[PDB]
Amino acid sequence: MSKGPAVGIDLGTTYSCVGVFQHGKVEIIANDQGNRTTPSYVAFTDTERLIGDAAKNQVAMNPTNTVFDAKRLIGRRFDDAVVQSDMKHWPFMVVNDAGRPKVQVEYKGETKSFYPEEVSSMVLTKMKEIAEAYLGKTVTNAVVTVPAYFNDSQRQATKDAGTIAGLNVLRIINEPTAAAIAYGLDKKVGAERNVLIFDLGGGTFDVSILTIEDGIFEVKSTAGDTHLGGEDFDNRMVNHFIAEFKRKHKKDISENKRAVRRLRTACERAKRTLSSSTQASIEIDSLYEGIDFYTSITRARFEELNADLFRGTLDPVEKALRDAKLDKSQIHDIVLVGGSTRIPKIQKLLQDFFNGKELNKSINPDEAVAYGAAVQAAILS
Amino acid sequence: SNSPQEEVELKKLKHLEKSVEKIADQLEELNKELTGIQQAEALCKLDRRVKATIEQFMKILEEIDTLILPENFKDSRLKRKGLVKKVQAFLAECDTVEQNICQE
Ligand SMILES: Cc1ccc2c(N)ncnc2c1
Numbered sequence: 001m002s003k004g005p006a007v008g009i010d011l012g013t014t015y016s017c018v019g020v021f022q023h024g025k026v027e028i029i030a031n032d033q034g035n036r037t038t039p040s041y042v043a044f045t046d047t048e049r050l051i052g053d054a055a056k057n058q059v060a061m062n063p064t065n066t067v068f069d070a071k072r073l074i075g076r077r078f079d080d081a082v083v084q085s086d087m088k089h090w091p092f093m094v095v096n097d098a099g100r101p102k103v104q105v106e107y108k109g110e111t112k113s114f115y116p117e118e119v120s121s122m123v124l125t126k127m128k129e130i131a132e133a134y135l136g137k138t139v140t141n142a143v144v145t146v147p148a149y150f151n152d153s154q155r156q157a158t159k160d161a162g163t164i165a166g167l168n169v170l171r172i173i174n175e176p177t178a179a180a181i182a183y184g185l186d187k188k189v190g191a192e193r194n195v196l197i198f199d200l201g202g203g204t205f206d207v208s209i210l211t212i213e214d215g216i217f218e219v220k221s222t223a224g225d226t227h228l229g230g231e232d233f234d235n236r237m238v239n240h241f242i243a244e245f246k247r248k249h250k251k252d253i254s255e256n257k258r259a260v261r262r263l264r265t266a267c268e269r270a271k272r273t274l275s276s277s278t279q280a281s282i283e284i285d286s287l288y289e290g291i292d293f294y295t296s297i298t299r300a301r302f303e304e305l306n307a308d309l310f311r312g313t314l315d316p317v318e319k320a321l322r323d324a325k326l327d328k329s330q331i332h333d334i335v336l337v338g339g340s341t342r343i344p345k346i347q348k349l350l351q352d353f354f355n356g357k358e359l360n361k362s363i364n365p366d367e368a369v370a371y372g373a374a375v376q377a378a379i380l381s
Numbered sequence: 382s383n384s385p386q387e388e389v390e391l392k393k394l395k396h397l398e399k400s401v402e403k404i405a406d407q408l409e410e411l412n413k414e415l416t417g418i419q420q421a422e423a424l425c426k427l428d429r430r431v432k433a434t435i436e437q438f439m440k441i442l443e444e445i446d447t448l449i450l451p452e453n454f455k456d457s458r459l460k461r462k463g464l465v466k467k468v469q470a471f472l473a474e475c476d477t478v479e480q481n482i483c484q485e
Pocket residue numbers: 230271272273275339340341342343
């Protein structure tokens with residue numbers, strides 16, 4: 001294989017993405033399964049190690065030895081509050097090893113431990129491989145993203161993952177900054193620009209305010225909810241449906257894991273449909289005790305079920321403006337990142353708060369940070 | 382009144398029926414090995430397989446759920462319910478294997 005170009009890699013909490021700059025355009029590379037995003041999942045089975053779709057697709061069969069959310073652990077101490085709180089919810093074991101966290105799994109019959117940056121290297125390895133399969137050339141040089149709030153430890157532990165994966169990390173860039181690069185915010189004529197990056201997706205919510213002068217990006221404030229995401233919207237749809245089944249049939253399907261899953265999978269398709277349609281239909285044959293479940297959901301009802309969560313996304317924006325010492329009128333640009341910003345209501349709420357200011361959403365909100373990261377990789381080539 | 386549109390749906394269901402026949406064969410093999418043992422360590426080796434068979438069946442039900450069929454498409458609607466009832470019966474067989482193996 002010939003020497004290839006530099007790639008941009010968005011290393012995320014729940015999903016990762018890789019992009020390349022070729023023929024004056026950014027191409028988001030699809031994986032072996034044909035997907036433009038790969039889950040940040042690594043499974044250790046009795047026979048092998050699976051990464052991405054293959055690891056996620058078998059999580060139900062091997063919950064304990066399937067690792068995900070390494071980004072929540074990377075660069076942090078074991079006694080860190082986030083680590084203590086988060087581990088109370090994972091199916092996998094997190095152990096203390098001289099003050100540092102390690103994840104304990106069963107790989108090929110043996111009990112093994114991996115550091116968060118070792119698990120992240122395995123995901124970065126899969127991104128490099130996804131890019132090589134597409135280009136038919138060897139990839140080494142890459143730009144990897146990190147959230148603007150990552151400290152010195154968290155930034156280096158990520159650089160370390162790139163190194164363990166065999167990548168030449170050209171630069172480490174803030175995700176919010178890479179979102180501004182994608183929309184060419186830096187190349188805009190005039191004075192300093194105040195930019196707000198609205199990130200809702202990949203199981204986290206991140207508001208970022210940056211000011212760019214002379215091609216310089218400065219984080220003026222970060223805010224958000226570390227546990228808010230699409231899945232929270234889903235639960236509200238599932239509860240609405242569970243209670244609807246109780247009303248129409250007087251049976252509780254909540255205690256049946258398979259009924260709830262069939263329903264959950266159907267709610268994720270419905271929520272997605274409700275981003276482009278005013279109604280979504282669900283037809284599940286023999287959902288519970290032989291009863292068929294044919295129902296429909298309005299965009300209005302979906303919005304009402306998540307009204308508190310949706311409005312609540314604006315408190316973080318307010319918190320960040322107060323910290324950056326800026327008025328809403330001083331924000332030059334609004335950038336939407338993450339899939340959950342595809343929701344019409346979130347868009348409406350944000351545009352109204354900014355008194356009708358048009359939002360930057362042209363680039364796929366899941367591919368936005370990886371697009372910029374690939375633009376930056378071309379510049380450093 | 383038989384429509385060309387219904388043929389598209391019927392073909393989707395025929396593929397799903399064929400996928401179920403593939404998974405069902407795996408389960409038959411599993412049942413045979415479990416019957417074979419019943420004639421401990423061997424049982425947790427079957428655990429990995431019965432869990433995978435369960436998952437393959439769960440992914441089939443998830444795919445079937447993505448289909449929205451018009452009442453007019455009667456033959457397809459009947460084929461769907463049949464397939465769901467067929468899969469659920471296999472899932473009960475799965476659960477029997479699972480409840481017998483890895484018992485303390
Ligand atoms: C089309 C589409 C894709 C993804 C999402 C999503 N992640 N959350 C909400 N709405 C969506 C809509």
